[PDB]
Write a protein that binds this ligand. Structure first.
Ligand code: HEM
Length: 82
Protein backbone atom coordinates (compact mmCIF):
# COMPACT_ATOMS: atom_id res chain seq x y z
CA UNK A 1 0.00 0.00 0.00
CA UNK A 2 1.19 3.52 -0.82
CA UNK A 3 -0.06 6.86 0.45
CA UNK A 4 -0.46 9.61 -2.14
CA UNK A 5 -0.27 13.31 -1.37
CA UNK A 6 -1.31 16.23 -3.56
CA UNK A 7 0.82 19.30 -4.17
CA UNK A 8 -1.84 21.25 -2.31
CA UNK A 9 -1.36 19.32 0.94
CA UNK A 10 2.42 19.15 0.64
CA UNK A 11 2.77 22.95 0.34
CA UNK A 12 1.27 23.30 3.83
CA UNK A 13 4.20 21.47 5.43
CA UNK A 14 6.70 24.30 5.52
CA UNK A 15 6.52 25.62 9.09
CA UNK A 16 8.39 25.25 12.40
CA UNK A 17 6.83 21.89 13.22
CA UNK A 18 6.70 20.28 9.80
CA UNK A 19 9.02 20.26 6.78
CA UNK A 20 8.24 18.09 3.76
CA UNK A 21 9.65 18.17 0.25
CA UNK A 22 9.50 16.14 -2.93
CA UNK A 23 12.38 14.29 -4.60
CA UNK A 24 11.66 12.16 -7.69
CA UNK A 25 7.89 12.01 -6.95
CA UNK A 26 8.49 10.70 -3.43
CA UNK A 27 7.43 12.72 -0.39
CA UNK A 28 9.97 13.12 2.44
CA UNK A 29 9.31 14.33 5.98
CA UNK A 30 12.61 15.94 6.98
CA UNK A 31 11.29 17.60 10.12
CA UNK A 32 13.70 15.74 12.43
CA UNK A 33 16.56 15.68 9.90
CA UNK A 34 17.01 19.46 9.48
CA UNK A 35 19.51 19.76 12.33
CA UNK A 36 21.48 16.67 11.24
CA UNK A 37 21.82 17.58 7.55
CA UNK A 38 25.52 18.05 6.66
CA UNK A 39 24.63 20.75 4.14
CA UNK A 40 22.81 22.77 6.78
CA UNK A 41 19.11 23.52 7.22
CA UNK A 42 18.83 26.69 5.15
CA UNK A 43 18.96 24.68 1.92
CA UNK A 44 16.21 22.37 3.17
CA UNK A 45 13.81 24.99 4.59
CA UNK A 46 14.18 27.05 1.42
CA UNK A 47 12.84 24.08 -0.58
CA UNK A 48 10.24 22.96 1.97
CA UNK A 49 6.71 22.42 0.67
CA UNK A 50 7.75 21.78 -2.92
CA UNK A 51 9.78 19.74 -5.39
CA UNK A 52 13.53 19.90 -4.70
CA UNK A 53 14.62 17.17 -7.11
CA UNK A 54 16.70 19.41 -9.38
CA UNK A 55 18.49 21.16 -6.49
CA UNK A 56 19.16 17.80 -4.84
CA UNK A 57 20.73 16.38 -8.00
CA UNK A 58 22.50 19.64 -8.77
CA UNK A 59 24.57 19.49 -5.58
CA UNK A 60 25.32 15.83 -6.29
CA UNK A 61 24.53 13.63 -3.30
CA UNK A 62 26.53 10.52 -2.47
CA UNK A 63 25.15 7.00 -2.62
CA UNK A 64 25.15 6.98 1.18
CA UNK A 65 23.00 10.12 1.46
CA UNK A 66 20.53 8.66 -1.04
CA UNK A 67 20.38 5.42 0.95
CA UNK A 68 19.73 7.46 4.09
CA UNK A 69 17.03 9.63 2.50
CA UNK A 70 14.89 6.51 2.06
CA UNK A 71 14.14 6.27 5.79
CA UNK A 72 12.31 9.63 5.57
CA UNK A 73 9.80 8.71 2.84
CA UNK A 74 6.15 8.96 3.90
CA UNK A 75 4.50 8.60 0.50
CA UNK A 76 4.40 9.69 -3.13
CA UNK A 77 3.04 12.56 -5.20
CA UNK A 78 -0.50 11.88 -6.41
CA UNK A 79 -0.47 10.66 -10.05
CA UNK A 80 -2.80 13.48 -11.10
CA UNK A 81 -0.27 16.13 -10.01
CA UNK A 82 2.63 14.58 -11.93
C1 HEM B 1 16.42 13.50 2.38
C2 HEM B 1 17.28 14.27 1.61
C3 HEM B 1 18.59 14.64 1.93
C4 HEM B 1 19.54 13.93 2.61
C5 HEM B 1 19.35 12.62 3.37
C6 HEM B 1 20.78 14.67 2.50
C7 HEM B 1 22.00 14.19 2.96
C8 HEM B 1 23.19 14.85 2.74
C9 HEM B 1 24.48 14.32 3.10
C10 HEM B 1 24.75 13.00 3.81
C11 HEM B 1 25.41 15.22 2.73
C12 HEM B 1 26.91 14.99 2.82
C13 HEM B 1 27.59 14.79 1.48
C14 HEM B 1 27.01 13.64 0.70
O1 HEM B 1 26.99 12.51 1.24
O2 HEM B 1 26.56 13.85 -0.44
C15 HEM B 1 24.69 16.35 2.19
C16 HEM B 1 25.29 17.54 1.75
C17 HEM B 1 24.62 18.59 1.15
N1 HEM B 1 23.25 18.62 0.88
FE1 HEM B 1 21.94 17.24 1.34
N2 HEM B 1 20.61 15.85 1.78
C18 HEM B 1 19.26 15.84 1.44
C19 HEM B 1 18.61 16.86 0.77
C20 HEM B 1 19.19 18.04 0.32
C21 HEM B 1 18.48 19.03 -0.44
C22 HEM B 1 17.01 18.91 -0.86
C23 HEM B 1 19.37 20.04 -0.71
C24 HEM B 1 19.22 21.22 -1.46
C25 HEM B 1 18.05 21.81 -1.95
C26 HEM B 1 20.64 19.62 -0.10
C27 HEM B 1 21.83 20.36 -0.14
C28 HEM B 1 23.05 19.88 0.34
C29 HEM B 1 24.31 20.64 0.33
C30 HEM B 1 24.54 22.06 -0.12
C31 HEM B 1 25.26 19.84 0.82
C32 HEM B 1 26.74 20.22 0.98
C33 HEM B 1 27.53 19.88 -0.28
C34 HEM B 1 28.93 20.47 -0.27
O3 HEM B 1 29.28 21.18 0.69
O4 HEM B 1 29.68 20.21 -1.24
N3 HEM B 1 20.52 18.38 0.50
N4 HEM B 1 23.32 16.10 2.16
Amino acid sequence: AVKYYTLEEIQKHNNSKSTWLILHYKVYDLTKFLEEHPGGEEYLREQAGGDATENFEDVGHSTDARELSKTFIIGELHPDDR
